Design a protein around this ligand. Structure first.
Ligand SMILES: NC(=O)c1ccc[n+]([C@@H]2O[C@H](COP(=O)([O-])OP(=O)(O)OC[C@H]3O[C@@H](n4cnc5c(N)ncnc54)[C@H](O)[C@@H]3O)[C@@H](O)[C@H]2O)c1
Length: 492
């Protein structure tokens, strides 16, 4: 049965349906970057609130700034913006639920002004983001906003026909001001240690390139809450979509699949209101940064440590690496010896138990999370997930070998062929550029480690780290992933 409003009451019995009248919802959030995570997390909690009969005025209007967003818009529009949330887990108490909290999705390609108008409408009180780890344009080595990027220069030159998130948000805020409409809160839901602070720094830096006045007004009227957002959400591959039809009879052009576990801890900093998400499990705390630092360092850091080595070994899913005891031992050593000592205190959390839950969640066999997804965009993910840890090891004079292996694994992985002879394309926005850095084995450490917006300035200037990187890369190439891990796991 095709998922749409017409068929909503004719799906399998076990399928949970929105308990509110879809036609009575009104928009309050504009979400930029409608992919899987937004749908499995923010749209999920908002739909859960609506099912209690509250917050029906907090519907989401999706926003797509990229050509690839057209397919998402068309797939959802063909379902009256309904989509299936399909939870997959082993120690499972999982549900299949139709989500009705997204009511539309606008594309910049259809009209820049229609999108500005939507973002500037008084009903829209929060502009949320899942624009990916590298979408904020801040160079982590020096904390500088990357004003020179072409799309940023484009928006400065054509503020009324922007293409980036910064250009759209500034144009919307200017229009709201001219109408006497209050600012909205900008709510980042991306994996950055201090995601709200980064969003603030970037938007202000961009606004400053326009005029001090817009910059000053934004600094004083817009809030940028930090958050820890957590819910493993694989890509919806054909197999995931077919499994939904096979098991629950729904023909959904684009369901979202995700693990049963879900958490959201937010700083309560909203200038123009927000849904009562705490009624459905969202947690609010004064300073969420140590929790987000913790999750990024341990969960995302471990994901990168597993993913390139796993792809090279020939694995294709996260649970497969967890079925390899050498990978599990390596992740535990990385988490316990390299990351843990660097973490700020996390009130109410026992780190040992938390690290075990990461092992448990990554071991979920039913979810089938793709290493191709986890590997994607390493050029933007390294400075967020791994380099901070490496820099601390370098500064402390601590062993860098396990962390260096992650970077060496990525370097070898960029050549595009695994140990079984299977060739792959590199899913990275700077793929061509990164593959170029590894065209000559003898020059890899000099070229790859010298990209400042990826690795910073400590790594290339560290003899200890460079030697470890070179040892690791040669071992991976000559002896393979398995033998390299065995040797490493025996170092003191
Ligand atoms: N997938 C997960 O398990 C998970 C968990 C926690 C947080 N996240 C966060 O959410 C993000 C998106 O993950 P996803 O799985 O939904 O990915 P996805 O590939 O399904 O969607 C990414 C979305 O971002 C848009 N996008 C990319 N670059 C952009 C840019 N510069 N400006 C505006 N939009 C841009 C894409 O067009 C698309 O709509 C991650 O990068 C991460 O920060 C994901």
């Amino acid at each position: 049965m095709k998922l749409n409003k017409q068929n909503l009451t004719q799906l399998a019995p076990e399928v949970k349906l929105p308990a509110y009248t879809l036609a009575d919802t009104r928009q309050g959030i504009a979400h930029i970057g409608v992919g899987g995570f937004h749908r499995a997390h923010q749209a999920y909690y908002t739909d859960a609130l609506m099912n209690t009969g509250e917050g029906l005025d907090w519907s989401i209007c999706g926003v797509g700034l990229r050509s690839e967003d057209r397919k998402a818009r068309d797939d959802l529009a063909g379902q009256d913006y309904l989509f299936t949330l399909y939870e997959l887990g082993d120690t499972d108490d999982t549900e299949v639920r139709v989500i009705g909290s997204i009511s539309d999705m606008l594309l910049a390609e259809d009209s820049a002004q229609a999108l500005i108008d939507k973002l500037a409408s008084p009903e829209i009180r929060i502009v949320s983001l899942t624009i990916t780890e590298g979408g904020y344009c801040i160079d982590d080595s020096n904390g500088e906003f990357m004003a020179h990027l072409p799309q940023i220069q484009h928006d400065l030159a054509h503020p009324s026909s922007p293409k980036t998130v910064f250009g759209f948000i500034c144009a919307a805020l200017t229009q709201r001001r001219a109408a006497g409409i209050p600012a909205f809160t900008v709510m980042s839901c991306d994996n950055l240690p201090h995601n709200g602070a980064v969003t603030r720094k970037a938007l202000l830096a961009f606004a400053a390139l326009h005029n001090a006045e817009l910059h000053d007004w934004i600094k004083a009227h817009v809030s940028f809450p930090n958050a820890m957002v957590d819910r493993i959400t694989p890509m919806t591959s054909t197999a995931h979509r077919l499994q939904l039809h096979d098991e629950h009879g729904i023909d959904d052009a684009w369901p979202v699949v995700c693990e049963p576990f879900v958490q959201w801890v937010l700083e309560d900093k909203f200038v123009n209101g927000r849904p009562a998400w705490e009624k459905v499990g969202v947690q609010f705390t004064d300073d969420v940064t140590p929790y987000e630092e913790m999750k990024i360092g341990l969960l995302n850091g471990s994901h990168l440590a597993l993913t390139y080595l796993g792809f090279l070994k020939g694995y294709r899913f996260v649970h497969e690496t967890m079925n390899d005891p050498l990978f599990v031992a390596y992740m535990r050593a990385y988490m316990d010896l390299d990351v843990t000592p660097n973490l700020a205190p996390v009130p109410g959390i026992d780190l040992t138990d938390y690290k075990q839950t990461l092992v448990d969640r990554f071991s979920n066999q039913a979810i089938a999370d793709q290493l191709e997804r986890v590997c994607s965009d390493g050029s933007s993910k390294f400075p967020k997930f791994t380099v901070p840890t490496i820099n601390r090891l370098i500064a402390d004079g601590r062993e860098t070998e396990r962390a260096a292996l992650v970077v060496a694994a990525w370097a070898l992985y960029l050549k595009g062929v695994d140990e079984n002879g299977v060739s792959y394309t590199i899913p990275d926005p700077r793929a061509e550029f990164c593959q170029g850095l590894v065209s000559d084995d003898a020059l890899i450490s000099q070229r790859l480690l010298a990209v400042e917006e990826i690795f910073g300035t400590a790594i290339p200037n560290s003899p200890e780290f460079v030697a470890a990187f070179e040892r690791c890369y040669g071992s991976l190439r000559d002896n393979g992933v398995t033998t390299t891990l065995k040797h490493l796991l025996k170092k003191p």
